[PDB]
Every structure is written in structure tokens, then in C-alpha cells.
Design a protein around this ligand. Structure first.
Ligand code: FES
Length: 104
């Protein structure tokens, strides 16, 4: 199944695209060639902070439990919020249809 995801880019523009249930948010950016500068540098291997996304609170609270490995890297991210995750760790579910995520 596919869902719609909106990305607010760091230039304030919204990029709307579709992703498949089970794909990571990095897969969504890559597969759809979204023009988000520098996003996903390390290719989803927890060796960068560049796939950092800011979530809506209601989505964030139902995401999978964060690992220490993700958290340690995420701690170093520019514009870290209490609703932040590394996007390459987050896989799409139907709860996320029409959600908005933001790139700081
Ligand atoms: S793409 Fe590097 S940790 Fe997510």
C-alpha cells in the first residue's frame, strides 16, 4: 500500500510524495529524488545526522522505541527537538498517511 507524505524542506517549501508501507523515510526521499540538500549522507547506517526529521507530536509518540545508537547520533543533530528522529530508522505505517515531517 502507498501513503502520502509531506516534507517541509529547510527552504520552507513543501514537497509532497508517496511512499510504500514499510519503506524508511530515507527510502522515500531517495526513491522519489526529493531535493533535500545533503539528506541521507550515510545511506541509513547510523553514521550521520543528516536524515534528521521533525515529526508532528501525535505521530512521534507512536514511533518505534529509539535505540541508544540512534539517540547518541541524534543528540548531535542541528535543530534537535523533542519530536526528532533519524528518518532512515523510521518505517512507514498507515498511521502516517498525510503526515508532515520537517527538515531543519
Ligand atoms: S542516513 Fe545517516 S543515520 Fe540516517
Amino acid at each position: 500500500d502507498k501513503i502520502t507524505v509531506h516534507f517541509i524542506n529547510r527552504d520552507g517549501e513543501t514537497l509532497t510524495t508517496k511512499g510504500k508501507i514499510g519503506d524508511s523515510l530515507l527510502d522515500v526521499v531517495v526513491q522519489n529524488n526529493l531535493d533535500i540538500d545533503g539528506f541521507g549522507a550515510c545511506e541509513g547506517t547510523l553514521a550521520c545526522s543528516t536524515c534528521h526529521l521533525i515529526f508532528e507530536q501525535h505521530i512521534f509518540e507512536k514511533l518505534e522505541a529509539i535505540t541508544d545508537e540512534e539517540n547518541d547520533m541524534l543528540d548531535l543533530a542541528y535543530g534537535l527537538t523533542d519530536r526528532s528522529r533519524l528518518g532512515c530508522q523510521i518505517c512507514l505505517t498507515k498511521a502516517m498517511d498525510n503526515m508532515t515531517v520537517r527538515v531543519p
